[PDB]
Enzyme design. Structure first.
Site, short mmCIF file in Angstrom:
data_model
loop_
_atom_site.label_atom_id
_atom_site.label_comp_id
_atom_site.label_asym_id
_atom_site.label_seq_id
_atom_site.Cartn_x
_atom_site.Cartn_y
_atom_site.Cartn_z
N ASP A 17 39.07 45.87 49.05
CA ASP A 17 38.56 45.04 47.96
C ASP A 17 37.16 45.48 47.55
O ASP A 17 36.37 45.94 48.37
CB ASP A 17 38.54 43.55 48.30
CG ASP A 17 38.32 42.70 47.07
OD1 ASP A 17 39.10 42.85 46.12
OD2 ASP A 17 37.35 41.91 47.02
N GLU A 19 33.58 44.49 45.01
CA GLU A 19 32.85 43.67 44.07
C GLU A 19 32.07 44.61 43.16
O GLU A 19 31.56 45.64 43.61
CB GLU A 19 31.91 42.67 44.76
CG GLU A 19 32.59 41.69 45.71
CD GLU A 19 33.60 40.75 45.04
OE1 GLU A 19 34.51 40.29 45.75
OE2 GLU A 19 33.48 40.46 43.82
N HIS A 175 33.77 35.52 46.80
CA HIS A 175 33.06 36.62 46.12
C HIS A 175 32.58 37.67 47.11
O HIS A 175 31.84 38.58 46.74
CB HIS A 175 31.88 36.10 45.31
CG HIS A 175 32.26 35.09 44.27
ND1 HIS A 175 33.38 35.24 43.47
CD2 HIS A 175 31.68 33.93 43.90
CE1 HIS A 175 33.46 34.20 42.65
NE2 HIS A 175 32.45 33.39 42.89
MG MG Z 1 39.19 41.47 44.05
#
Ligand code: MG
Ligand code: CO
Ligand code: MG
EC number: 3.1.13.-
Lengths: 209, 209
Positions: A17, A19, A175
Site C-alpha cells: 500500500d 500514501e 491513512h
Molecule cells: Mg490505498
C-alpha cells in the site's frame, strides 16, 4: 500441491500500500509505502511472512496536492517523520522480495493491493526514478483485492470488505500505509484460505468428499 | 437476495475487451471494442445478457505502432472492415448499459476485463475524446479476471484460465475483441457461479447444510 509456487503459477504475491500527494503517479510524490510478503505452511494455508514499512521523502521536483495532504494528514516537511529516500525503501523491499521468490521457488512477484493499479503505478514510477535494476514485480499483472472481495464478500470498499470478513477495522488508522497493508494482507489471506476450506482449491478437492 | 443488484453492492458488471494500436491509452488508436452485459436468473445464477461489438476507426491524430498491428493483425486502412467512430461505438454501449443499470436496480457499471486496467484506460480515453456525458462506468474500480482466475483456478493467462475452467479456447480468434470478450464473460460467470455453488455465496449458505 501445498507450495506457494504452485498456487499462482509461480507468482509470489506481495501486499503493498502507498500514501501519496495526489492522483498522478508520474508527477506526484510518493509519501509512504509498506510491503508484506506471504508464505504457505506445510498444509497450504496462506499467511503473512515479512512486513516492511517506510515514510518516504518526496522526490526532487515532485508535486504535492494540498487536497491530498489534507486527506491523508501527512506533512512531508515535518523533520520527525523519519523519512527515507525512494531508493532506500524500494531497494530494501526488492531485496526481501527476491529472497522470498528464491526460497519459495517462485519466478516473479505480483502486487496484491486494494484498487491495485493505483499502488502499482506509484511503486513502478518510484522504481524508475530510483534507477533500480531487476525489478522483481510483474510489469502489469496485479491481484486487486477490491475485485477479489467483490467475488468473495460482495463488497469492494476496503473497510466494508474487512468488516464483512469478520475483521476489525480502525478508521483512525486508515491513512497509514502500514495499517492498510496489514488489513489488506489479512483480507487476501482470508479470501484465499476460505476458497480452499470450502473445497474450491486444489481443483481436485471437489471430487474427494 | 438473488438479484444482480445484491451481488456486488449495486455495481452492474459489464465485460469489455479492446484491441489497440499500442500500449498508451492516451496516444494510441482504439481499433476494436466489444461489450457483454450480464444478468442473473431468478435463482441467482449469472450469465451473459446483451452482446455488442465494433470495429473502430482510429481517432484523428492517433499514433499506430507497427508492432501492435503485427501482433493483432489489424489493418485500419482496409475499407472493408466496417469501422465506426469511437463516438458511435461507445454511445451505443453506454445506452445499453444505462438501460441495464435501470432495469436491474443497480447504481453504476463496473468493467470486467482481463488485466482490466488496460481496457479501462482505453475505454475511458475514447469516452473523453468522444465527449460522452454521464459515463456509467466507475472511474477507477474494475473486476480483473486475471486476478479472479488466479484465485479460482490458479491461472492468470486468459487462454490457460479458460482451459483450466474446462472451456474451449481457439487461439486463431484470440486477436478478436468480440471473441475475447465472450470467453472472458463465460470465465467470469463460471467463477462467480462456482463460488455460489460450492457454498461461498450468499454468506449465510455455509451454515445452512
Ligand atoms: Mg490505498
Ligand atoms: Co475486417
Ligand atoms: Mg485483452
Amino acid at each position: 500441491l501445498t507450495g506457494l509456487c504452485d498456487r499462482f503459477r509461480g507468482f509470489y504475491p506481495v501486499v503493498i500500500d502507498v500514501e501519496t500527494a495526489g492522483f498522478n503517479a508520474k508527477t506526484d510524490a510518493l509519501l509512504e509505502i509498506a510491503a508484506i510478503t506471504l508464505k504457505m505452511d506445510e498444509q497450504g494455508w496462506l499467511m503473512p511472512d515479512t512486513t516492511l514499512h517506510f515514510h518516504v521523502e518526496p522526490f526532487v521536483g515532485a508535486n504535492l496536492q494540498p487536497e491530498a495532504l489534507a486527506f491523508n494528514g501527512i506533512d512531508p516537511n515535518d523533520p520527525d517523520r523519519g523519512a527515507v529516500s525512494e531508493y532506500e525503501a524500494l531497494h530494501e523491499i526488492f531485496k526481501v522480495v527476491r529472497k522470498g521468490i528464491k526460497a519459495s521457488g517462485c519466478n516473479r512477484a505480483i502486487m496484491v493491493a486494494h484498487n491495485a493499479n493505483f499502488d502499482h503505478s506509484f511503486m513502478m514510477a518510484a522504481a524508475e526514478r530510483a534507477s533500480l535494476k531487476r525489478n522483481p514485480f510483474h510489469p502489469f499483472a496485479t491481484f486487486d483485492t477490491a475485485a477479489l472481495a467483490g467475488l468473495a464478500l460482495g463488497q469492494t470498499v476496503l473497510s466494508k470488505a474487512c468488516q464483512t470478513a469478520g475483521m476489525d477495522f480502525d478508521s483512525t488508522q486508515a491513512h497509514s500505509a502500514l495499517y492498510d497493508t496489514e488489513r489488506t494482507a489479512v483480507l487476501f489471506c482470508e479470501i484465499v484460505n476460505r476458497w480452499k476450506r470450502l473445497g474450491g482449491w486444489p481443483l481436485s478437492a471437489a471430487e474427494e468428499v
